[PDB]
Ligand binder design. Sequence first.
Ligand code: MG
Ligand code: MG
Ligand code: MG
Ligand code: MG
Ligand code: MG
Ligand code: MG
Ligand code: MG
Ligand code: MG
Ligand code: MG
Ligand code: MG
Ligand code: MG
Ligand code: MG
Lengths: 25, 97, 87, 81, 96, 217, 206, 129, 121
Amino acid sequence: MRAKWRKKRTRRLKRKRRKVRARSK
Amino acid sequence: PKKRASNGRNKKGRGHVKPVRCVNCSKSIPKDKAIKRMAIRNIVEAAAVRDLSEASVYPEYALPKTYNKLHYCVSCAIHARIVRVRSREDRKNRAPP
Amino acid sequence: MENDKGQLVELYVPRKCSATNRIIKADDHASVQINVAKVDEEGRAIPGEYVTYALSGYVRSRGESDDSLNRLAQNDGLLKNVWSYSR
Amino acid sequence: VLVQDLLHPTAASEARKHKLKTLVQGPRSYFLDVKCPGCLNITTVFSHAQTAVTCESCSTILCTPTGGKAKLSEGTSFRRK
Amino acid sequence: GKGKPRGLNSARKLRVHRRNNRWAENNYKKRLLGTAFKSSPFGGSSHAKGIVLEKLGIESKQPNSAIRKCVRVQLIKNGKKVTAFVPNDGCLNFVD
Amino acid sequence: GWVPVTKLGRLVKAGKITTIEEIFLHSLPVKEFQIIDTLLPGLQDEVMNIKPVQKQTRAGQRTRFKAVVVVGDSNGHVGLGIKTAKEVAGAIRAGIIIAKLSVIPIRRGYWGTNLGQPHSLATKTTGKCGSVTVRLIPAPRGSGIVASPAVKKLLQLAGVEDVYTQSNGKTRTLENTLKAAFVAIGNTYGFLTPNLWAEQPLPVSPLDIYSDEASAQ
Amino acid sequence: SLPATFDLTPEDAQLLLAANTHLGARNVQVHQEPYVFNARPDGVHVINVGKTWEKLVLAARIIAAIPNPEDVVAISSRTFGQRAVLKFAAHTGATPIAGRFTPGSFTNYITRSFKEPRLVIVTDPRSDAQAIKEASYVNIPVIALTDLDSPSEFVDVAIPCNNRGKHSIGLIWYLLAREVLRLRGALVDRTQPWSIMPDLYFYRDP
Amino acid sequence: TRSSVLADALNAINNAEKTGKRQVLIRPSSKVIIKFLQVMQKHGYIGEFEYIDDHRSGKIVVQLNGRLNKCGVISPRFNVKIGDIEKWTANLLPARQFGYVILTTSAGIMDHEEARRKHVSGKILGFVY
Amino acid sequence: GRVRTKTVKRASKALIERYYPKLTLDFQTNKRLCDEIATIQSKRLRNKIAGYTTHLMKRIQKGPVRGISFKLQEEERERKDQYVPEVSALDLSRLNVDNQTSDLVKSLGLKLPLSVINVSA
RNA sequence: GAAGAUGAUCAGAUACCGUCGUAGUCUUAACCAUAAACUAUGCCGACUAGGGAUCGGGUGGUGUUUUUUUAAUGACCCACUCGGCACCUUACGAGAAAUCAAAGUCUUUGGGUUCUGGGGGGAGUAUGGUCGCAAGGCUGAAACUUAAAGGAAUUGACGGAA
Ligand SMILES: [Mg+2]
Ligand SMILES: [Mg+2]
Ligand SMILES: [Mg+2]
Ligand SMILES: [Mg+2]
Ligand SMILES: [Mg+2]
Ligand SMILES: [Mg+2]
Ligand SMILES: [Mg+2]
Ligand SMILES: [Mg+2]
Ligand SMILES: [Mg+2]
Ligand SMILES: [Mg+2]
Ligand SMILES: [Mg+2]
Ligand SMILES: [Mg+2]
């Protein structure tokens, strides 16, 4: 697992997490 | 670790050089790094000189030359056997042959 | 070094470099000792009697053994006009 | 050289060294008694003189400034100090 | 100048710098956050009584191959569930 | 003695050089262990560690055995020898030879008062090998050797009675630790104290005095 | 301490000037700058032959102080000094190593070529670097026939001469042999010249 | 920038003594440098030293004889009570029988031994051994 | 594939080293005396050693061979290297001297017959 | 030329390769504030070793070229010097080594100062604050888990490397 692409995976996880957090709030 | 003191290139005091393109694959490689061979050939052959001079007007014409500075990238030069990977003690040699 | 009753306890007082005054120690294998022959009247050698210089390995490995020996030979009169103090 | 005289270095070495890096730093510049072909008077001009120096009576440029020493111009004569 | 300040009046910079870099230790971080009381089931204590809920048999890690014969214990003082190894031959026959 | 090559051996095993301090004063290189055997007959030996060192082969892992041996009488001399060989007995037998050839003098002194017969070192000394730094500090009477049980054994075979030790680096590497301590007790004559400041008349080597007895035909 | 005769005689000056022993290297080592006298245009420096003779006499005094004479080992790896070393060997005691040095000669006590000199003289500290390096392991003083560019690393008595020419090398070895024999007393009187004339020390072809 | 001319001077002395030179040149030659060198010369660690007076700050040529191992500067000049001179000597000096810790004391710049004989103490400059 | 091993070449070298007032350029004479001066364990090895000895003797007869060190070769090389030319180089055949070398002579305080030529840079 | 379209190949259906082509590449006004932003080497100062080559400036040759009967200025040569980008040899020294004239002047430990790191993951994550139009940037844990992860080099093996 390239650290660049794992970073991009976690960056997409950031977007999904703040999307569902703004959905609830 | 540091395989080369001049890291792979010739950049001491710039920060940026410019990129050129490889002649074999058009990779963007820096101009100091690239690998640069001047191809100066005759315009005909090593063998067709007799034919052209025999079937030429203007006796002893010029036998003109063609000139082409070729920029390679490292992968293309190694594959085309232009630089040909060296030993640890011998890669410090900067002599042209 | 001595104890309180005199009685030097050294085992061996080491030699010193004639140039840099460092101790020449027992495994300083680059250090040399040069004996220059004492020349009498009408230029013989006097076998046995020397002018002795000890040079440490540091001086020789830094290349100043020749110039140091020029200085210490001229100070003892073995040379006349070789070493000059003001370079 | 591992042993040398630093109080009395040779004059050939001190004349080679930089003006700040000698034993005592002093200038290598000098002054010049300069006279024109025309006027009889004498002007004291610096060596590295930075200025188009004229006489008080002259209208004539004695030296032209350059990067180092001033170039003494136009056939004028000079003497040191 | 080997990193750190050295001057006679530079004791506050040295003291606060040691205080700041002191947090990278495991024990100082743990002791000043007080994680033994917030977490770590025995609340800073050595021993704790609990009540067995069920006997477990834990698979041992590779390359070992055994059943480890533990119990699931609910602590009286917290209510926290832990797993505790019954540490001799037999001895799971002794608990309940 | 035993048909010596090396002029120093032809002098020592004939009887012209009788003390090992005559060798150490002129820094004469010792290339035969029987020189040290004659000049220091009470030179006890201690193997400190046997370890196997392996080289990966085209098929297999060939191993040799590497021995560290500290020799030295407890009156001011040690040698540390390290030798690897196919068998452990050959490793000991040749490491004793290398440790005998590597005999150096140490400078015992005082923690400080000149009340007789030196017990400690004369100076804080240090030595490095690899990452390991070993520092030896003069210690008062009755302190003993405050050192790890290998450096302590080397200093016991040096005749050091009292010394303190600091150590840095990976001291579990016994070869580097023993070589660092060996360099450190070699540096005691490396240091120039004020009692050694006196000018000495720079004597003649025994190879020059007894030049007839050396270089035999 | 050398009374009056050990001054550079004008006949010896004729020899040293005629053999071009005063033609130093274009590049001068910082340790050999004492021996330079006023470099000429074209860049060739001039070796002070008075100091060359004084260092030669000092080297001869050091050679004629080893008691037995067969452990003053004379080294030449160079063709211009092979014959000079061999004739120095024949005239003085002087164990020669003319040709290849065979490393492990001063260390490595079980070889056939194991020697222990009390003094090593080398023709060239560049080409004879193995002899100087190996003499740096077993406490051996080194006299070298240095030029102005040759290194003085582990060289204790540097006789400044021209290393490029064969006449300079053969003459300096000839003069060193002559002064060693005069100090030993094998040559009776310092004023009369040696009957051995300096051309049996030069390299020849054929 | 230049913050300690004594540290620069003593560094130059150490660097020439390590490489075996018999002399240094020191710029820019303070009174603390002159007094430190006078203590070292009194105890035999250097020879004659000579102050070149240019009209700016002075230079010094010290004649190093052979007998110096390490002269150094303890910067900052710590306040040193009379009870903890011996911590400083046990830390900086190779043995109890030689080596001197130089103190700036209100009775003058002096080593620790005749700071003890005068029963005075103060700031620490450095050491010589 | 006629390369000779070290047990042939070393033995032949030692035989020339200690028996040069002996064995000649003839293989049969060398073969017959290799039976008496040496104990070679087989006839083929004796013939190989004697043939290599013959080859090296025929080689020595036109110029010497390195590695062979017998007592006669030292003496003939020394009487060949004892040549002294009577044309006497380093003698004054006219002393061509430069200007700085004349200054060197004057600084040394000696009187020499010189001949100064200007040097172009 | 990201995306996207399409042509081939591939066991799965090699994303490589071919032809197009949006955003983009360029510019103006405003944002962003990150790069293997690297010399993976903070900034100031001192000392320690030889060397040649080069860039900028300066100084000196009764030097070469403009030979025109004691031939300006430029260009060049030689020697110094200051400042710079670097380089070669050595290892005094340093380093775990690779290597380093600094990564030296360090257990003989202190020239001045700022920033950072404390086993590997979890994790540059959660949350809070703040900045941004957004993308995100700066700041930034813990629970839990783990006996190694890693660095340099040696021998072997292997290479669709020579
Ligand atoms: Mg790699
Ligand atoms: Mg960049
Ligand atoms: Mg530790
Ligand atoms: Mg960043
Ligand atoms: Mg970085
Ligand atoms: Mg800054
Ligand atoms: Mg420069
Ligand atoms: Mg961590
Ligand atoms: Mg962050
Ligand atoms: Mg957030
Ligand atoms: Mg990494
Ligand atoms: Mg690795």
